[PDB]
């Protein structure tokens, strides 16, 4: 008997935060 | 018999976090 | 019986963290 | 008994690309 | 008895870039 | 008895960047 259990699980995030603030007055 | 469990897990995250405040006046 | 049980688990984590402030007045 | 032969050879030329600019108040 | 032949080379020449700018109050 | 030949020879290139330039506040 063969079992070839093929199962991969691909979980990688590929992330990009940015935040951009101009001038605040108070 | 033939058991051939491939299963990888991946978890890599790529990460890249940026903040720009420009002149803060109080 | 032949057991070949590949489950590589990667976590690895590539980070980049960057903060710029310019000129603060109070 | 089970003879297997795999001949696994994967090219992976995969690009994932992630750019991001922020730009905030501009004078001239 | 099970005789198992595996010939597993990879050539994972794959690139993650995460390339990021961050510009803020600009004058002229 | 089970006699297993594994030839595993993984070619990895890939190349990981992670890039990051932060700027604030510029005059002309």
């Known amino acids: 008997?063969?079992?070839i259990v093929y199962k991969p699980?691909?979980?990688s995030?590929?992330?990009s935060?940015?935040?951009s603030?101009?001038?605040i007055h108070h």
Do not use: A, P, R, S
Request: charged content about 25%; aromatic content about 0%.
């Open 1 to 3: 008997k063969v079992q």
């Open 9 to 11: 699980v691909d979980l």
């Open 13 to 15: 995030k590929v992330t």
């Open 17 to 19: 935060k940015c935040g």
């Open 21 to 23: 603030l101009g001038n």
